[model samples]
Target: MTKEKISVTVDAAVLAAIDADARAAGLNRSEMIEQALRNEHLRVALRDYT
Candidate 1:
């Protein structure tokens, strides 16, 4: 897959949560974030489809 670099801002607490979750799940920050985005995209698409 092709990847691009982009900047985004997150609240400090949310960033901490992401880091913690990533560590616990054995994923790096980028992978965790992408997983979340893909899940959210699928959820919205499924909701719209139904």
Candidate 2:
């Protein structure tokens, strides 16, 4: 999918938490969220299929 710049509302604490893990995991904040969304989609798909 093509990348699109957009805004999202997030809690400061949550953002800070992810920001720390993101740097440690070698991913930026955006990539971290993208990966999270992808994981969630896969999880739902598996549950729906089975």
Candidate 3:
């Protein structure tokens, strides 16, 4: 898939939480963010079907 770069501002505490979760899952911050987006997309897609 083609990828593009985008910037977003998040709360520092939220990012720290994500970083901790990512560490527990053996993923870097970027990978964790990507996984989160993908999961959200899947959730919405399923919601549409139901």
lDDT string, candidate 2, 1-50, tens digits: 69989999999998999899899999998999898889999999999999
The positional error of residue 33 in candidate 2, measured at the CA in angstroms, is 1.2
- For model 2 the local lDDT of residue 2 reads 91
- Backbone clashes, each candidate: 0, 0, 0
Q: How close is candidate 3 to the true structure, as a TM-score?
A: 0.77
* Model 1 lowest lDDT segment of ten: 1-10
lDDT of 3 by residue, 1-50 (tens): 88777899999999999999999999988899999999999999999999
User: On a 0 to 100 scale, what is the lDDT of residue 15 in model 1?
Assistant: 89
Cα lDDT computed for each candidate against the true fold: 0.95, 0.93, 0.95
Pairs in steric clash, model 2: none
Q: Name the better of 1 and 2 by TM-score.
A: 1
Would you give me the overall lDDT of model 2?
A: 0.93
RMSD in Å for all candidates: 1.1, 1.6, 1.4
Best by TM-score: 1
Residue 10: error of model 3 in Å? Answer: 1.0
- Of candidates 3 and 2, the better by lDDT: 3
